[PDB]
Structures are given as structure tokens and as C-alpha cells.
Design a protein around this ligand. Structure first.
Ligand SMILES: N#Cc1ccc2cc1Oc1ccc3cccc(c3c1)N1CC[C@@H](NCc3cncn3C2)C1=O
Ligand SMILES: CC(C)=CCC/C(C)=C/CC/C(C)=C/COP(=O)(O)OP(=O)(O)O
Ligand SMILES: OC[C@H]1O[C@@](CO)(O[C@H]2O[C@H](CO)[C@@H](O)[C@H](O)[C@H]2O)[C@@H](O)[C@@H]1O
Ligand SMILES: [Zn+2]
Lengths: 407, 313
């Protein structure tokens, strides 16, 4: 019947996926077991013996939460006073995924605000008058591209942006996050993302970058913040997405990376963890799961004859079940895991990940798997930039009509 | 002098020693978005921070002001940068600053700015004498803090402090053998000291790891480390490992062991092994077992491996 939809997480055999601590308890197993116990309770609340109602994405609640945050916030957000362009991006992208229109007035206001965040030396800062930083720069550019109007596009001072990127480029191929700032793979991705979107890439800008990123891939197969460090979904997404932009994915061992990321999906929870032996978290629905469409594209480019033509290489259904059943705040907004409070960051990435899990696309092949009521279907998102594919094409097309600053 | 929560704290707009400079309000535009309704104390400090920054005032009062700005928002990298400019201009005692950053990190260990500030200080002083102990204290509170481990690797590598890190690794693995950050540090230490080409070292590591696996069969980190130290040369280059794992299958089985067997067969087929057909059949049977029963969450991956194997052999 159409009113009942069996769930992977509710199958009787699913109970066998519970943690086996081998009777050896450590802080790690204890914490993992606590999360699993809570998740099982949640899973069970969606099952009524043989009756399993379709899962529902609470669109309207999320919309109202997002709409409100786009204008004002309590002092509880003072901790994000240096990341306001991020708030703009997370909220606009969530609304975009939910196919919620952005009023022209709101759009122009966002544009004006981001213009105030733009530094005369190039790039964007966390707020008006703050020094530029690659993180909010990445967010500001993505936000402007989501709006996608000529007004939004023209706010970006491309000449200064390129000069700014140059001012952060290190001889070993890496980038500083900001002047006198720290270095890790996030910088390479932030730089590659904004430079490719705005068409300001020069032949020497990323010289050595691909090699530096490859040095960040470690024995685990994933990528760490810097060479030598532990593999993490966040840095792995940044590293591979940056390489895809640079068309240098082959610099990595794609086999060990693929096996590593697929191993990051939790057999019981269905969601993804950020690194081996740590906890499941809704935001990794994007950082980790987003690596599969990137890997698919990379392998497809090499002519891999074994690639699927209908599914990503992760459990699409299980991820949707984790997000829909465990990551939605009843009052609107999404989150890390049951018991955590909602925030715009998790709302953005949980939704971004849900969209990736619902939509497969390779070549002319398109295969959707929308769990629950059909209204759950979200707008697609680009795996590299994490903004609508339509937004990427429109922005790149617009900027490609402009010359690279100073050539 | 006085902290933001101290009973005698006075807003900067009320301080006589600050009356000579006008505060600079933050301009969010006529129709603000993502507008944070700051507390009176928060806005007060930042209105003056903006004034000193805009004035590029390298002063002691400006220096003390950054401390308050930091307490209000330790993630404000602009304040941190300006504070470092002041440390330089005012020729401040860096050891005193180290004591400051030590307390700051203890309070907010999951923050990029605080760890970078500490690294800059250590670089300026060329003094790593307090690092390993300080980091150890942070890790004693959260054994997986990413910034802490990253800072540790930098210090060790930059100042060549490799001598006692393997002992440190062994102690933490004893406390929690599932701590993936520690297995990572283990690889970091060995690869940068003796390396893994020394067969005596590799044997020691394989034996150590196999022992940890027998103790905790379902701990993924040990399995991942085992594959990690053998993958570059090729899993099929270690014939005895296959036999040993094969004997454990009936008992200490698990998706990790089964998956490891597939990884071995994969490499074997890649190296023109004998009984190609037999190996391929074994590998395909295991891929099916993993996809259908033992590791269903990764069914798509295992189906892909099955198809890849057939396309190649
Ligand atoms: N850069 C970075 C980074 C470092 C650590 C995490 C996630 C990260 O991804 C991002 C990306 C951009 C961000 C911009 C402003 C604040 C952020 C960001 C986190 N933080 C810090 C506290 C936090 N929360 C932490 C958190 C929540 N879920 C996973 N994490 C780990 C959270 O939103
Ligand atoms: C563009 C951009 C800025 C991307 C950021 C990507 C990203 C998510 C990086 C995470 C890095 C990190 C230090 C994780 C540890 O935090 P943790 O210990 O709190 O989390 P954990 O327990 O899940 O590992
Ligand atoms: O996933 C292993 C894979 O990563 C590379 C880099 O692309 O090397 C990493 O892992 C090695 C251990 O397997 C380390 O020696 C090296 O330092 C680290 O960068 C590839 O060479 C390897 O196949
Ligand atoms: Zn999260």
C-alpha cells in the first residue's frame, strides 16, 4: 500500500548491526553505544508493527526557521560574529534546496550586506570592517551565486580577489586561510571554489596545489588537514573537491579513498561519522556522502566499466532514514544527532546531504530515490560547490564573459 | 586588569582613559540581514576595537582591549591578528603571552585561531619546551582533539622531538585502543623515524596490530592500520597473512576480516597469481556475502567491487 513504506533501519536483521564491543570497553565504545541506544529508540518510534507511515521532511517548519534567521539573531550568535557570510550561505542554500523563493528585497539586502563585508584588499571578511578570510570569502561567493542576479555577481571585486588569493599562496602549493593565518586543506578548496566560479584562475595560481593536497591523503585513504594528519570527512571533501576543480583527481589513490569514505557510513545509524571510531553526525551527510558523486565523476572520466548507472556508492536509503528520523528538530531546523540543538550549519548540510542521497546523475542517466512522501524531494545540489547546479552554470557562464584580471 | 565577568568591570564607553577616542559603530547597512542582537557589553568592546583598528593604534590599552574582544568571541581572527601586531610593536613578553594562550586553549580547545596563535608564539620564541606537556593535558581531556594532534605533529617535526612519542602512543592505545587519532600518530612517528622499509620494524608492527585485533576483533582502527602499513607494497606480497587471517575467519570473523580477504584477493589477481579462476570465485563469493549479509550498508560498494573484479580478471 502507498501509505506504508518499509524501512531499512526497521528490518529485524538491522538489530544485528549494533556495536559489538568484544567485551572490552573504552571511552570510544561507551560513547558509540550510548548514541546507538538513543537512535534505536528513535527508529522504533516510527514503526507500528507492520504499519510504517511514510517519512516526512518538515519543510514548512524549516522554512520559517530559515526565514527568521536571515534577518535577525539573538546574542546566542555572537560566537558567529566573524562568520556572518556563512549564515547567509547556509540559510540561502537551505532555502534553495527547499525550493523556497527568495524575495527580491531580501536578495538585494543580502547583496548590500556582503558588499559591506568585502575587503578593499580583496576577499570577504566575517563582517563589516573585518579582515578578509578564505572561509567567509567562500561563503560570500556561494551566497551571491545562489542569488544569481547581475547585481549579486557584480558585487565581487574580481581584480582584488585574485590579488588576495596570490597574497595567501605558499611556495609548497598550500594557501593560508588569511594573512598571518593557519594553513590546512580548507584553504585550497575555498580558493579553488571562488576562483573557478568567478573565472580568475591563472596558470600559476594553483601551481603545486594538487601535489600538496595529495600529500594530505594518508594511510587511511582519506585526507587530513595537513600532511601527516588523521583522515577527516571535512578535509577529504575539501581536498577532492579542490582537485576536481583543478582536474587533478588522479593525483590521489582513488581506490583507498573510496574504501575509506564508504567505511564512514555507520552500519547501525545509517548516517556518516567524520573519522574512524568517532560519532555519527548529520552534517557529514554532505561532507562524506558528497564524496561519492565526486568519486563517481572521477572514475567515470577514467572509463571505469564497473560504475553503477543508477546509484551512488553508499546506502542512499539508510542516509535518508537517519536524516529524516533523527536529524529534524520538531520546531524547524536540522541537527547533528538526537539530543543536540538545531543550528543553521547542520540545517544546511543535513539538507545538502539529503539531496545528494535522493538524486543520482551521470551522463544522461538520472535515477531518483525519494524516501517518504514525494514532497520530500529537494532541489539538486552541485557536489563540488554545494549550491544549485543551475546556479553554478549561470555564474560560470556569466564570469567566463569577463577576462581573468590582468590576464 | 579586569575581566568581562568581574564585578568591577566597566564598559569602555565609561572609562576615562578611553574618553579621548570615539567608538566606531559597525555599519550593517540600512536593511541588515543575519543581524546579531549583541549584548551591551559585546557591542561596547567591539565599537572600541573597531576604533583602535581603524586608527591602527599600537598601544597598551589597545592590547588589553583585544583580551576582552577575544573573550567575547575567540573565533574573531581579526582581533587575534591585531593582537599579534601589538605583541610585536609593544615588544610584549612572549612567555607571558604563552601563559595567556595556555589558559585560553584550555577553555576553548576546539578553535582554529587559538592554536594558530600558540604556534606563532612558539615559532617566534623558537621554544617548544612546554608543548608536549601542554598538548598532553589537552588530550587528557579530549583524546581526539584534532587541533591538538595537529599541533603536536608540527612541534615534533619542526623541533625534532621524536624520542618519546612512540611511548606516548603506546600509553594512549592502552587507555583506548579504538582511538583512531593515536593509530594515526603511530604511523606518523614510525614513518618519520625508522620508516616501514625495515623488515624488522614492519614485522613488529604487524605482530602488534594482529595482537590488538585478537584482543578487540571489531575495532576498525587496528584493521585499517594493518592495511595501511601493507597496502603500498601490495597485500598479496604477504602470503602468510592470508593464511593466518583464513584460520581466524571461522572464529574471530567479522566484516573487517572478510573485507580484508577481498582486499588481498584483489591485489593477488592484480599480480598474476596462480589459480586465477579460484581466487576470483572466492573474491566474488565474499563480495556477495558482504553485500547481502555481513556489510549490507556498503552493498553498492561491494557490488561495484564484484563488477570491477570481473571487468579486470
Ligand atoms: N572549518 C571547520 C570545521 C571544524 C570542525 C567541524 C566542522 C567544521 O566545518 C565548519 C565550516 C564552516 C564554519 C563556519 C563558522 C562556524 C563553524 C564552521 C564549521 N563551526 C565551528 C564550530 C562548529 N561546530 C563544529 C561541528 C559540527 N559538526 C561538525 N563539526 C566539526 C561550527 O558549526
Ligand atoms: C569549506 C570548509 C571551511 C570546510 C570545512 C570542512 C570540515 C567539516 C572540516 C572538519 C575538520 C575538523 C577539525 C574536525 C574535527 O572536529 P570534531 O572533533 O568536533 O568533529 P568529529 O568528532 O565529528 O571529528
Ligand atoms: O591512501 C594511501 C595512498 O595515499 C598516498 C597519497 O596519495 O600516500 C599516503 O599514505 C601512505 C601510506 O599508505 C604514506 O606513506 C604517505 O605519506 C601518505 O601521503 C599514496 O601514496 C597511497 O597509495
Ligand atoms: Zn556536525
Amino acid at each position: 500500500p502507498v501509505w506504508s513504506e518499509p524501512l531499512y533501519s526497521l528490518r529485524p536483521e538491522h538489530a544485528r548491526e549494533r556495536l559489538q564491543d568484544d567485551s572490552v570497553e573504552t571511552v570510544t565504545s561507551i560513547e558509540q553505544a550510548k548514541v546507538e541506544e538513543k537512535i534505536q529508540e528513535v527508529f522504533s518510534s516510527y514503526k507500528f508493527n507492520h504499519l510504517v507511515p511514510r517519512l516526512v521532511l518538515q519543510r514548512e517548519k524549516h522554512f520559517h526557521y530559515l526565514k527568521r534567521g536571515l534577518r535577525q539573531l539573538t546574542d546566542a550568535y555572537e560566537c558567529l560574529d566573524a562568520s556572518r557570510p556563512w549564515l547567509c550561505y547556509w540559510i540561502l542554500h537551505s532555502l534553495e534546496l527547499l525550493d523556497e523563493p527568495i524575495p527580491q528585497i531580501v536578495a538585494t539586502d543580502v547583496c548590500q550586506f556582503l558588499e559591506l563585508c568585502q575587503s578593499p584588499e580583496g576577499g570577504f571578511g566575517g563582517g563589516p570592517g573585518q579582515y578578509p578570510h578564505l572561509a567567509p570569502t567562500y561563503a560570500a561567493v556561494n551566497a551571491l551565486c545562489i542569488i544569481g542576479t547581475e547585481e549579486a555577481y557584480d558585487i565581487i571585486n574580481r581584480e582584488k580577489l585574485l590579488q588576495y588569493l596570490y597574497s595567501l599562496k605558499q611556495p609548497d602549493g598550500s594557501f593560508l586561510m588569511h594573512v598571518g593565518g593557519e594553513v590546512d586543506v580548507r584553504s585550497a578548496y575555498c580558493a579553488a571554489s571562488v576562483a573557478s566560479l568567478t573565472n580568475i584562475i591563472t596558470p600559476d595560481l594553483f601551481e603545486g596545489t594538487a601535489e600538496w593536497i595529495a600529500r594530505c591523503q594518508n594511510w587511511e585513504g582519506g585526507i587530513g588537514g595537513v600532511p601527516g594528519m588523521e583522515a577527516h570527512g571535512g578535509y577529504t571533501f575539501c581536498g577532492l573537491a579542490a582537485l576536481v576543480i583543478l582536474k587533478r583527481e588522479r593525483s590521489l589513490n582513488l581506490k583507498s579513498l573510496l574504501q575509506w569514505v564508504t567505511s564512514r557510513q555507520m552500519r547501525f545509524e545509517g548516517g556518516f561519522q567524520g573519522r574512524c571510531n568517532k560519532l555519527v553526525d548529520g552534517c557529514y551527510s554532505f561532507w562524506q556522502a558528497g564524496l561519492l558523486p565526486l568519486l563517481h565523476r572521477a572514475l567515470h572520466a577514467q572509463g571505469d566499466p564497473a560504475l553503477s548507472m543508477s546509484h551512488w556508492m553508499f546506502h542512499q536509503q539508510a542516509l535518508q532514514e537517519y536524516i529524516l528520523m533523527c536529524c529534524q528538530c520538531p520546531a524547524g531546523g536540522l541537527l547533528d544527532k538526537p539530543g543536540k540543538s538545531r543550528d543553521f550549519y547542520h540545517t544546511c548540510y543535513c539538507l545538502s546531504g539529503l539531496s545528494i542521497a535522493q538524486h543520482f546523475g551521470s551522463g544522461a542517466m538520472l535515477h531518483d530515490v525519494v524516501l517518504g512522501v514525494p514532497e520530500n524531494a529537494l532541489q539538486p545540489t552541485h557536489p563540488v560547490y554545494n549550491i544549485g547546479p543551475d546556479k553554478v552554470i549561470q555564474a560560470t557562464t556569466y564570469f567566463l564573459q569577463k577576462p581573468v584580471p590582468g590576464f | 586588569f579586569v575581566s568581562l565577568d568581574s564585578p568591577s568591570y566597566v564598559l569602555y564607553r565609561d572609562r576615562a582613559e578611553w574618553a579621548d577616542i570615539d567608538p566606531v559603530p559597525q555599519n550593517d547597512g540600512p536593511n541588515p540581514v543575519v543581524q546579531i542582537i549583541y549584548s551591551d557589553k559585546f557591542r561596547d568592546v567591539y565599537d572600541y576595537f573597531r576604533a583602535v583598528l581603524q586608527r591602527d593604534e599600537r598601544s597598551e590599552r589597545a592590547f588589553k582591549l583585544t583580551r576582552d574582544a577575544i573573550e567575547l568571541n575567540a573565533a574573531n581572527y581579526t582581533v587575534w591578528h591585531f593582537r599579534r601586531v601589538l605583541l610585536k610593536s609593544l615588544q610584549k613578553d612572549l612567555h607571558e603571552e604563552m601563559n595567556y594562550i595556555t589558559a585560553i586553549i584550555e577553555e576553548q580547545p576546539k578553535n582554529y585561531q587559538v592554536w594558530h596563535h600558540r604556534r606563532v608564539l612558539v615559532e617566534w620564541l623558537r621554544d617548544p619546551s612546554q608543548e608536549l606537556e601542554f598538548i598532553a593535558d589537552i588530550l587528557n581531556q579530549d583524546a581526539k582533539n584534532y587541533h591538538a594532534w595537529q599541533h603536536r605533529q608540527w612541534v615534533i617535526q619542526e623541533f625534532k622531538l621524536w624520542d618519546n612519542e612512540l611511548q606516548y602512543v603506546d600509553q594512549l592505545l592502552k587507555e583506548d585502543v579504538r582511538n583512531n587519532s593515536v593509530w594515526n600518530q603511530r604511523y606518523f612517528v614510525i614513518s618519520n623515524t625508522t620508516g616501514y622499509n625495515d623488515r624488522a620494524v614492519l614485522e613488529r608492527e604487524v605482530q602488534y596490530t594482529l595482537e590488538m585485533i585478537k584482543l578487540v576483533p571489531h575495532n576498525e582502527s587496528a584493521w585499517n592500520y594493518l592495511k595501511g602499513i601493507l597496502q603500498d607494497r601490495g597485500l598479496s606480497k604477504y602470503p602468510n597473512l592470508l593464511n593466518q587471517l583464513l584460520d581466524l575467519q571461522p572464529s574471530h570473523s567479522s566484516p573487517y576480516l572478510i573485507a580484508f580477504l577481498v582486499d588481498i584477493y584483489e591485489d593477488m589477481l592484480e599480480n598474476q597469481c596462480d589459480n586465477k579462476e579460484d581466487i576470483l570465485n572466492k573474491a566474488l563469493e565474499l563480495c556477495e556475502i558482504l553485500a547481502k549479509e555481513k556489510d549490507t550498508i556498503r552493498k553498492e560498494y561491494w557490488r561495484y567491487i564484484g563488477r570491477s573484479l570481473q571487468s579486470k580478471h
